[PDB]
């Protein structure tokens, strides 16, 4: 039996808020306006965030109950989705900008510095705007991020699905606590979960660029980042 299923709704929320990684800073010639400087800052940042993400995942209730192999698979599948939802979340209060770090706020004009990137920047901005207009709460955000981790590679069993149901229970618990009627609760649950399809889409589309040879060649990538990319390229044509 997994401890996770025995947690109460409030306990699940507290566990997830406690597990939150910190918001990292970029390196401090700032304002990147070249393919190289942009890739340099973003890959450096992503690499550091990955270490925090791995340690965060271990603290997501139920993740620890998976085999090491299963844990590797979920993280390989979800890592870019998880970076992306984080980015969209912390960009909420900065309409029209993406807050990559407190000291790295980019607009779409900088998205053009790397070929293929501006389309994704635009999707991320749209997603941040959608979160802002839904008034997404931190409690809901951490539930969604945990659902991404558990859901994005589950289709290779019962355990992950029982945990996912518990997170669902936890989201509704949050909405009912916020005073939403039953109709509003199910409408909001659906609204949030449909955004996850968009986050998957953005990851698939960004990943396809990131594991291309051109994108791999811009700057030397860390061994860890290359391994996380290769996990997806494995299946590419």
């Amino acid at each position: 039996n997994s401890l996770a299923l025995s947690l109460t709704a409030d306990q699940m929320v507290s566990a997830l808020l406690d597990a939150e990684p910190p918001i990292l800073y970029s390196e401090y010639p700032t304002r990147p306006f070249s393919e190289a400087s942009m890739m340099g800052l973003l890959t450096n940042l992503a690499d550091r965030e990955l270490v925090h993400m791995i340690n965060w995942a271990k603290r997501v209730p139920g993740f620890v109950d998976l085999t090491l192999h299963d844990q590797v698979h979920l993280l390989e599948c979800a890592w870019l989705e998880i970076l992306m939802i984080g980015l969209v979340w912390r960009s909420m209060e900065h309409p029209g900008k993406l807050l990559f770090a407190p000291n790295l706020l980019l607009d779409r004009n900088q998205g053009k510095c790397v070929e293929g990137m501006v389309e994704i920047f635009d999707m991320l901005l749209a997603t941040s705007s959608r979160f802002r207009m839904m008034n997404l709460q931190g409690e809901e955000f951490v539930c969604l991020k945990s659902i991404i981790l558990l859901n994005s590679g589950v289709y290779t069993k019962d355990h992950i699905h029982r945990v996912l149901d518990k997170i669902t229970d936890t989201l509704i618990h949050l909405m009912a606590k916020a005073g939403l009627t039953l109709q509003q609760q199910h409408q909001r649950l659906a609204q949030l979960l449909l955004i996850l399809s968009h986050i998957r889409h953005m990851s698939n589309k960004g990943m396809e660029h990131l594991y291309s040879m051109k994108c791999k060649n811009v700057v030397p990538l860390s061994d860890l980042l290359l391994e996380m990319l290769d996990a997806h390229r494995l299946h590419a044509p």
């Binding site: 270490v51 791995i54 271990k58 090491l68 844990q71 590797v72 993280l75 390989e76 061994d223 860890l224 391994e227 996380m228």
Partner: peptide, 10 residues
């Protein structure tokens, strides 16, 4: 093997 394998352990 994979770095991720190592990082997930301790």
């Amino acid at each position: 093997h994979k770095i991720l394998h190592r990082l997930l352990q301790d």
